[PDB]
Design an enzyme around this catalytic site. Structure first.
Site, short mmCIF file in Angstrom:
data_model
loop_
_atom_site.label_atom_id
_atom_site.label_comp_id
_atom_site.label_asym_id
_atom_site.label_seq_id
_atom_site.Cartn_x
_atom_site.Cartn_y
_atom_site.Cartn_z
N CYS A 57 18.09 -23.40 -167.28
CA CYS A 57 18.79 -22.86 -166.11
C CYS A 57 17.98 -23.11 -164.84
CB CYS A 57 19.05 -21.37 -166.25
SG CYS A 57 20.09 -20.70 -164.90
N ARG A 88 17.58 -19.76 -161.82
CA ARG A 88 16.91 -18.51 -162.18
C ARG A 88 16.19 -17.82 -161.02
NH1 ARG A 88 13.26 -20.11 -167.11
NH2 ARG A 88 13.74 -22.27 -166.46
N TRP A 92 27.48 -19.15 -160.24
CA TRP A 92 28.28 -20.07 -159.46
C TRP A 92 27.81 -21.49 -159.76
CZ3 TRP A 92 25.41 -16.18 -156.98
CH2 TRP A 92 24.17 -16.60 -156.48
N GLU A 111 27.28 -30.35 -161.45
CA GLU A 111 27.99 -30.09 -162.70
C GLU A 111 29.43 -30.58 -162.61
OE1 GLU A 111 26.89 -26.08 -164.52
OE2 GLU A 111 26.36 -25.71 -162.41
C1 HEM Z 1 23.91 -17.99 -159.99
C2 HEM Z 1 23.94 -19.33 -160.05
C3 HEM Z 1 23.56 -20.16 -161.30
C4 HEM Z 1 23.32 -21.47 -161.25
C5 HEM Z 1 23.36 -22.32 -159.95
C6 HEM Z 1 23.00 -21.96 -162.58
C7 HEM Z 1 22.69 -23.26 -162.94
C8 HEM Z 1 22.64 -23.80 -164.22
C9 HEM Z 1 22.75 -25.19 -164.61
C10 HEM Z 1 22.95 -26.38 -163.62
C11 HEM Z 1 22.63 -25.26 -165.94
C12 HEM Z 1 22.68 -26.53 -166.83
C13 HEM Z 1 24.10 -26.71 -167.33
C14 HEM Z 1 24.34 -28.14 -167.74
O1 HEM Z 1 24.17 -29.05 -166.90
O2 HEM Z 1 24.73 -28.38 -168.90
C15 HEM Z 1 22.45 -23.91 -166.45
C16 HEM Z 1 22.30 -23.54 -167.76
C17 HEM Z 1 22.19 -22.23 -168.21
N1 HEM Z 1 22.25 -21.07 -167.44
FE1 HEM Z 1 22.32 -20.95 -165.35
N2 HEM Z 1 23.08 -20.87 -163.43
C18 HEM Z 1 23.43 -19.75 -162.69
C19 HEM Z 1 23.62 -18.48 -163.23
C20 HEM Z 1 23.32 -18.09 -164.53
C21 HEM Z 1 23.49 -16.75 -165.08
C22 HEM Z 1 24.07 -15.58 -164.24
C23 HEM Z 1 23.09 -16.78 -166.38
C24 HEM Z 1 23.02 -15.64 -167.43
C25 HEM Z 1 22.89 -14.35 -167.10
C26 HEM Z 1 22.63 -18.14 -166.67
C27 HEM Z 1 22.12 -18.64 -167.87
C28 HEM Z 1 22.08 -19.97 -168.26
C29 HEM Z 1 21.90 -20.48 -169.60
C30 HEM Z 1 21.67 -19.64 -170.86
C31 HEM Z 1 21.97 -21.80 -169.58
C32 HEM Z 1 21.80 -22.71 -170.81
C33 HEM Z 1 20.30 -22.92 -170.72
C34 HEM Z 1 19.55 -23.07 -172.02
O3 HEM Z 1 20.12 -23.53 -173.04
O4 HEM Z 1 18.34 -22.72 -171.99
N3 HEM Z 1 22.81 -18.90 -165.52
N4 HEM Z 1 22.45 -23.06 -165.37
C1 LIG Z 2 26.02 -19.44 -165.81
C2 LIG Z 2 26.15 -20.91 -165.50
C3 LIG Z 2 26.34 -21.34 -164.19
C4 LIG Z 2 26.45 -22.71 -163.94
N1 LIG Z 2 26.64 -23.17 -162.67
N2 LIG Z 2 26.39 -23.59 -164.98
C5 LIG Z 2 26.20 -23.18 -166.26
C6 LIG Z 2 26.13 -24.11 -167.29
C7 LIG Z 2 25.93 -23.72 -168.62
C8 LIG Z 2 25.85 -24.75 -169.71
C9 LIG Z 2 25.01 -24.59 -170.82
C10 LIG Z 2 24.95 -25.55 -171.83
C11 LIG Z 2 25.73 -26.69 -171.72
C12 LIG Z 2 26.57 -26.87 -170.62
C13 LIG Z 2 27.40 -28.14 -170.51
N3 LIG Z 2 26.50 -29.30 -170.29
C14 LIG Z 2 26.63 -25.90 -169.63
C15 LIG Z 2 25.79 -22.35 -168.89
F1 LIG Z 2 25.61 -21.94 -170.16
C16 LIG Z 2 25.87 -21.41 -167.86
C17 LIG Z 2 26.07 -21.83 -166.54
CL LIG Z 3 31.21 -26.71 -166.44
#
Ligand code: HEM
Ligand SMILES: Cc1cc(N)nc2cc(-c3cccc(CN)c3)c(F)cc12
Ligand SMILES: [Cl-]
Ligand code: HEM
Ligand SMILES: Cc1cc(N)nc2cc(-c3cccc(CN)c3)c(F)cc12
Ligand SMILES: C[C@H](O)[C@H](O)[C@H]1CNc2nc(N)[nH]c(=O)c2N1
Ligand SMILES: C[C@H](O)[C@H](O)[C@H]1CNc2nc(N)[nH]c(=O)c2N1
Ligand SMILES: [Cl-]
Ligand SMILES: [Gd]
Ligand SMILES: [Gd]
Ligand SMILES: [Gd]
Ligand SMILES: [Zn+2]
Lengths: 401, 401
Positions: free
Chosen positions: B105, B108, B277, B282
């Site tokens: 993420c 964070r 958001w 993405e």
């Molecule tokens: C507030 C704005 C947030 C942004 C901009 C953001 C951004 C991202 C992005 C770009 C990814 C990678 C997804 C992909 O390309 O496949 C990701 C993954 C993830 N996000 Fe965030 N996120 C946000 C909020 C959150 C929240 C609120 C949570 C949980 C409370 C969260 C938990 C996670 C988790 C669990 C993953 C998968 C990561 C892993 O497998 O370690 N995110 N996030």
């Molecule tokens: C919370 C949140 C926000 C965001 N803006 N993006 C997020 C993307 C993923 C995500 C995790 C694993 C695989 C994929 C698809 N590649 C997306 C997720 F869990 C959460 C997201």
């Molecule tokens: Cl998506």
């Protein structure tokens, strides 16, 4: 026991059985991954038996008379002298294998086409300089670039080492100012000071080709000017942005790395410069746009009249693409071999498939194979990869100071 | 303790937090598998004891009366019941830590600002639906998006799990075609078929919002149509390419991931959807340009009158940049929260610095943190990282079908 590897664009699955042969243990543990880190007496016999065994399987000659005989000669040579000499063909085979084993090289589709210049009979910096000069002129080839490696004598105990002090044979000067900051390439500030601190007459330029600090065993390094007609350079212009030429940017034709250590069959060659041809993102994105290199991104964006006041205009991305366009166009206009990151990654995918059939896998370093712009637009992004060390190999080594 | 270097600046830090990593990852000294997408009361007790110690550390009460009392209470409840229950404030802290610990993420910096909805008293799939609609409504907030998680009842002996079958709360259908192609989103073909099998009457557009398939313990999944007015969407246009609007592209405001497992102190919540958001890449790069998703890249490049016959024109890079511009402009026009990859990675660098002071490190997956376009134009590209698994944690789990 064999990692399952998936390609997410297509759905295809393979198994890297080759990973079971890995030797030099890498930096990762079950506890924590360090994949993103840039830098992670008769044991000699074991690495020799293994490398000789590699050589004869490669020529369908394992268990045959000459294989037996070559096993004994190295055993005898180490018994009496402590080291051993590689046969000519073995050194050629080892150099190609080390390239083939390099996990961070996207250009390995070319691994079979490599010209190996045997310089093991060298002595003194004046002999080195002529060998290097032969390499540069052969590799440059009026811009029709050809992969080459020159192998200087193998390190032996109780004697000094052959070393090239520059990280590449062609590098640009980096000088400070009345304010600490650098004119020229900041990646080469250290070697630029070691060149001035050795007799060189520093220029006043952004693109001054440095001199070679060549080091024969147990003697101080010696400067050498490179023949200017031997250093082929490409002035940078853009196909449609006429002011780009006036920025005055250039890069050199030949990427020739001169600070890595070639390791074959337990022998170590700390001077073994190799060269290929550039992938355009190396020049346009890393060398010119990295904030700690020439750092030109904002200057180009101003010229393009882009809105540098908010990041969400993607002005950085727009300027970067046009810089890369100007690299490819300039090199093509000058008839100097160059490859774009789309062509290069597509060929690497083909390499992976070839290597799957030939050897059951391929050591690949995802973070280095994926290009530094447009990552997910290339096929390697969607390809899972296994990273591990095989021998023979190119290794990083401390600077000789 | 791993030494970690930032290459843009020269900074050096050690990740002492990584030594606390409990559960184990896929890498070994032989081989790195960092690029892979998918890497007893006594043990329940020892996880809970570690979470309780975390919680009482965070409120500056470690080793206090209330701390020992809670440890004994938990041991007593695991003895009598085989499980235990979180206090409300422990659940809130636990959900925030799980986000804080999520290595892939980039968002964070926001981890402390998380609205936690406690739905652990949920009784049926119908009630589950009501909690989800309230989540979507609160988190969307008419375009001013707020981060939120809703926690449904934990896994417990004697009962099946609550599960959300959809991978996100808002997803577009993908219909297999007459000729075997896909209309809509190919990532969602499986869930689209399941919905139809469970009584959904399909549409046949490319942006049809899917129903929710919600499973109560020991019940089949039940279909629920999301109310149109609850799903905020953004028609996509380009600020200067007027034909772009005629592609008819749209995306939804709320990224709400709903198929991950939330683990806190040995307890597991198989249904706890969370949302934040979008980062614009993405949508623009991955969802729209991936060859196996909407795959619009070549259609856009042709409309731009780019030369699509040669890779070295960089038509793919140019088309992708304009698609990302369109996403950012469209969301800003619609007044829906969105962050670009430059702002997001810059805030992530500040998160890493905050976390080095706070905990001595930060788990981060370089290959996921670095955006899929313009990688080395962002500061995270030049930062080495250490990937490891801390608990509380969000985990992948198998699909319920
Ligand atoms: C507030 C704005 C947030 C942004 C901009 C953001 C951004 C991202 C992005 C770009 C990814 C990678 C997804 C992909 O390309 O496949 C990701 C993954 C993830 N996000 Fe965030 N996120 C946000 C909020 C959150 C929240 C609120 C949570 C949980 C409370 C969260 C938990 C996670 C988790 C669990 C993953 C998968 C990561 C892993 O497998 O370690 N995110 N996030
Ligand atoms: C919370 C949140 C926000 C965001 N803006 N993006 C997020 C993307 C993923 C995500 C995790 C694993 C695989 C994929 C698809 N590649 C997306 C997720 F869990 C959460 C997201
Ligand atoms: Cl998506
Ligand atoms: C022929 C065209 C070639 C291309 C297009 C190419 C491309 C590349 C690129 C882009 C890198 C990444 C380096 C960086 O970005 O810092 C790299 C690394 C490397 N290349 Fe190649 N290269 C070529 C030829 C060669 C040759 C001829 C050799 C050796 C004989 C070689 C050996 C290596 C090694 C050892 C590395 C470092 C890899 C590692 O640490 O595993 N390359 N190459
Ligand atoms: C031969 C060759 C060609 C090319 N086109 N590129 C090359 C890049 C490197 C290289 C390897 C590790 C680090 C660095 C500097 N980051 C460069 C290298 F050794 C050789 C290269
Ligand atoms: C920190 C990170 O590992 C470092 O910046 C790496 C990432 N990937 C790279 N990839 C290539 N080809 N060359 C590089 O120098 C780097 N640098
Ligand atoms: C195989 C490869 O690791 C895979 O395609 C990854 C790479 N990095 C990623 N990074 C993010 N943020 N999201 C992704 O889906 C992926 N995909
Ligand atoms: Cl270079
Ligand atoms: Gd102007
Ligand atoms: Gd226009
Ligand atoms: Gd069309
Ligand atoms: Zn690893």
């Amino acid at each position: 026991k064999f990692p399952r590897v998936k390609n997410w664009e297509v759905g295809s699955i393979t198994y890297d059985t080759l990973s079971a042969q890995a030797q030099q243990d890498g930096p990762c543990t079950p506890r924590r991954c360090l994949g993103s880190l840039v830098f992670p007496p008769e044991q000699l016999l074991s690495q020799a038996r293994d490398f000789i065994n590699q050589y004869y399987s490669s020529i369908k000659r394992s268990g045959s008379q000459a294989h037996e005989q070559r096993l004994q000669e190295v055993e005898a040579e180490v018994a009496a002298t402590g080291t051993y000499q590689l046969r000519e063909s073995e050194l050629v085979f080892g150099a190609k294998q080390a390239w083939r084993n390099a996990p961070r090289c996207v250009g390995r589709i070319q691994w079979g086409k490599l010209q190996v210049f045997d310089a093991r009979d060298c002595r003194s910096a004046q002999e080195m300089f002529t060998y290097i000069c032969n390499h540069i002129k052969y590799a440059t080839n009026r811009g029709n670039l050809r992969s080459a490696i020159t192998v200087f004598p193998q390190r032996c105990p109780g004697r000094g080492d052959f070393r090239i002090w520059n990280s590449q044979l062609v590098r640009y000067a980096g000088y400070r100012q009345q304010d600490g900051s650098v004119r020229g390439d900041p990646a080469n500030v250290e070697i630029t000071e070691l060149c001035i601190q050795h007799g060189w007459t520093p220029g006043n330029g952004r693109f001054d080709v440095l001199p070679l600090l060549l080091q024969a065993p147990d003697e101080p390094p010696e400067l050498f000017l490179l023949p200017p007609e031997l250093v082929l350079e490409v002035p940078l212009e853009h196909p449609t942005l006429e002011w780009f030429a006036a920025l005055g940017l250039r890069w050199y034709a030949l990427p020739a790395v001169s600070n890595m250590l070639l390791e074959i069959g337990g022998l170590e060659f700390p001077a073994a410069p190799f060269s290929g041809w550039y992938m355009s993102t190396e020049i346009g994105t890393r060398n010119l746009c990295d904030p700690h290199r020439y750092n030109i991104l904002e200057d180009v964006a101003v010229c393009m009249d882009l809105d540098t006041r908010t990041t969400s205009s993607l002005w950085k991305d727009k300027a970067a693409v046009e810089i890369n366009v100007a690299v490819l166009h300039s090199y093509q206009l000058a008839k100097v071999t160059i490859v774009d990151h789309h062509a290069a990654t597509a060929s690497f995918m083909k390499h992976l498939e070839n290597e799957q059939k030939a050897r059951g896998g391929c050591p690949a370093d995802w973070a280095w194979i994926v290009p530094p712009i447009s990552g997910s637009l290339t096929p390697v992004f969607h390809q899972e990869m296994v990273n591990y060390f095989l021998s023979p190999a190119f290794r990083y080594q401390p600077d000789p100071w």
